[PDB]
From Swiss-Prot:
Organism: Saccharomyces cerevisiae (strain ATCC 204508 / S288c)
Job description of the protein: Fatty acid synthetase catalyzes the formation of long-chain fatty acids from acetyl-CoA, malonyl-CoA and NADPH. The beta subunit contains domains for: [acyl-carrier-protein] acetyltransferase and malonyltransferase, S-acyl fatty acid synthase thioesterase, enoyl-[acyl-carrier-protein] reductase, and 3-hydroxypalmitoyl-[acyl-carrier-protein] dehydratase.
Subunit description: [Alpha(6)beta(6)] hexamers of two multifunctional subunits (alpha and beta).
Misc: Present with 91800 molecules/cell in log phase SD medium.
Signal peptide: none
Family membership noted in the UniProt record: Belongs to the fungal fatty acid synthetase subunit beta family.
Record's protein name: Fatty acid synthase subunit beta
Superkingdom in the source lineage: Eukaryota
Gene name as annotated: FAS1
Amino acid sequence: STRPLTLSHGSLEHVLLVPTASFFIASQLQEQFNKILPEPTEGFAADDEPTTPAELVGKFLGYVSSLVEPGQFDQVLNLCLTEFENCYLEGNDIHALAAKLLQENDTTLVKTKELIKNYITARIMAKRPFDKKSNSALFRAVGEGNAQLVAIFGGQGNTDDYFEELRDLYQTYHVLVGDLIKFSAETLSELIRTTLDAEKVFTQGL
């Protein structure tokens, strides 16, 4: 059996059906989550507060992932992961859900990025990587011969604040590109050290 509970944030709230076996673990995690979640506001126009139930579930998911560390809360993590997927990710990619939330609902781009971050980090933390190949319409079309893809890479001049893009790509997808970025930093530092006059150019370091 599975007694239910309601992860709620003021006006907006969502109901979860946890198994009876781990109901107490779920309830303690829920109480902690209400403890770390700020009071609701009219219009939810402020930050750090969900605006739609999808956002609330994703925030709970990220909180559990923060406590989850590869056993205690693992089972509830998986259970609520599956509930969120089955209710909000109708066999569609998380990015599709984020785009839906932006376009139709009145959610900020930052909140959608945070939801993506929570869901993806939880998916990796729950031993549910994305090893299974996707069925994205575009790549299906390419395989069927319907479409042809060419990849292009830009360069200097596009923007004055590119490091912000690097920052966002690090923050949201930390669990996917952390190794890449760390290897990049390490090899860059090694090249600086081995290169004769690099440090002369790199006055403030790299």
